[PDB]
């Protein structure tokens, strides 16, 4: 029952998305997950499953870089979690993101 990660932000760097968060407890690992935004209302009712960012399943820093072709042009949700190896943290706040940008 670890504390949840905080200050979740997305940015763009070259052909990559960069997801940054802040965590105060040292010696932690993180897992980054994503979801289609429309899944919270159309199926809703927990009739969906969160997915993992391809190479951010077990990151060691408070940062995650991943290619932009991980996503299509749409609206996605991102969330982060932490573990000590045994105990897992509550899930971060879900952030919404538009991959098109206009």
């Amino acid at each position: 029952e670890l504390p949840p990660p905080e200050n979740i932000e997305v940015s763009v760097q070259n052909q990559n998305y960069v997801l940054k968060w802040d965590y105060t407890y040292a010696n932690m690992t993180f897992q980054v997950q994503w979801l289609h935004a429309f899944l919270k209302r159309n199926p809703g009712n927990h009739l969906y499953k969160w997915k993992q960012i391809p190479d951010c399943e077990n990151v060691k820093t408070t940062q995650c870089v991943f290619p932009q072709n991980v996503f299509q042009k749409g609206i996605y949700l991102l969330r982060v979690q932490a573990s000590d190896g045994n105990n897992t943290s509550f899930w971060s706040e879900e952030i919404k993101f538009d991959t098109e940008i206009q």
């Epitope: 289609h36 499953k49 391809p54 399943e57 290619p67 996503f71």
Partner: antibody, heavy 119, light 112 residues
Framework: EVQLVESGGGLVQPGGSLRLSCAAS????????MTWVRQAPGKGLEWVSV???????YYASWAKGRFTISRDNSKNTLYLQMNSLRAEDTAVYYC?????????????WGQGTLVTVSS | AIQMTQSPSSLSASVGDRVTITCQAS??????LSWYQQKPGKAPKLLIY???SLASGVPSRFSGSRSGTKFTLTISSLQPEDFATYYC?????????????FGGGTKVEIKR
């Protein structure tokens, strides 16, 4: 009771155009990722293209130049437009529904239509 | 762009054997690998999703496992009705351009 029924396909001359269609029966077509997958004679499955719920199109590299996926929401129908067809395009073409909610896999196929590109 | 390397291309085995198909991704795709069975003259049938989750109506002899970018489909007791071609399907991220790839397939014939 949901089903995908493709039509079109048949004998088409090299360089010609063709439009495959796929009628979805029993479900709301525009709320799934819909894909075309092809199988050349005696070969494996080959992913051709996908259209998502917002209407964005994504392709395999070799298919992007000559193939166009689309859908008519007023007809509940998916389409694959094929221009400048090659003999190497001769294949069975399958309509296929991708479930992104849970599976992240293909959960429903059409029966396939044969496309023969020959003179 | 992602590629799935499936192995073996074909195999023969007796009724009751334990057979294993392997499929390696060119890069990590998390668990987003599914396994399909194609009988002669029919469309493919979904067997396994998320690397290890059996689809509805699939006998318990089919199982799936992951280890990095190497995925394994296993048939524990091969049956005569299992003659088929098996494909893996890897979807990188949300399957954008060249983000979806089938493996080459594996023909499975029963040795009698």
């Amino acid at each position: 009771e949901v089903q995908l029924v493709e039509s079109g396909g048949g004998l088409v001359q090299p360089g010609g155009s063709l439009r495959l269609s796929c009628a979805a029966s029993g479900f709301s077509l525009s709320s799934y990722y819909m894909t075309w997958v092809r199988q050349a004679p005696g070969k494996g499955l080959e992913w051709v293209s996908v259209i998502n719920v917002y209407g964005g199109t994504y392709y395999a590299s070799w298919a992007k130049g000559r193939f166009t996926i689309s859908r008519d929401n007023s007809k509940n129908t998916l389409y694959l437009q094929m221009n400048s067809l090659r003999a190497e395009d001769t294949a069975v073409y399958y309509c296929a529904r991708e479930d992104v909610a849970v599976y992240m896999a293909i959960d429903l196929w059409g029966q396939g239509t044969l496309v023969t590109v020959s003179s | 762009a992602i590629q799935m390397t499936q192995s073996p291309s074909s195999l023969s085995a007796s009724v009751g054997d334990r057979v294993t198909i392997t499929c390696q991704a060119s890069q990590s795709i998390s668990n987003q690998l599914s396994w399909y069975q194609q009988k002669p003259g029919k469309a493919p049938k979904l067997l396994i999703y998320d690397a290890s989750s059996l689809a509805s109506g699939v006998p318990s002899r089919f199982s799936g496992s992951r280890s990095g970018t190497k995925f394994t489909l296993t048939i524990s007791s091969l049956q005569p009705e299992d003659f088929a071609t098996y494909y893996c399907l890897g979807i990188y991220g949300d399957g954008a351009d060249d983000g979806i790839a089938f493996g080459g397939g594996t023909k499975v014939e029963i040795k009698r």
